[PDB]
């Protein structure tokens, strides 16, 4: 930091993929959503 002279890491803020596990559409209309390589503490904060 150009003032306090501290060493700060830089880790990219989580990205990943979204996969929909479907029982079928001929069986049921339910789904489950997998957020790959993402901790669940961060899943609800997203657009769309």
């Amino acid at each position: 930091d150009p003032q306090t002279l501290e060493i700060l890491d830089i880790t990219p803020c989580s990205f990943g993929g979204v996969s929909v596990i479907t029982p079928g559409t001929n069986t049921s209309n339910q789904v489950a959503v997998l957020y790959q390589d993402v901790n669940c503490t961060e899943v609800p904060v997203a657009i769309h």
Binding site: P12, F15, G16, G17, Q36, D37
Partner: peptide
């Protein structure tokens, strides 16, 4: 099998490393 395992998920610019189905 212990020797064969001791003789041999990274975040990056869009790169992903999916895990295998059979652990």
């Amino acid at each position: 099998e212990d020797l064969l395992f001791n003789k041999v998920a990274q975040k990056f610019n869009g790169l992903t490393v999916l895990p295998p189905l059979l652990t």
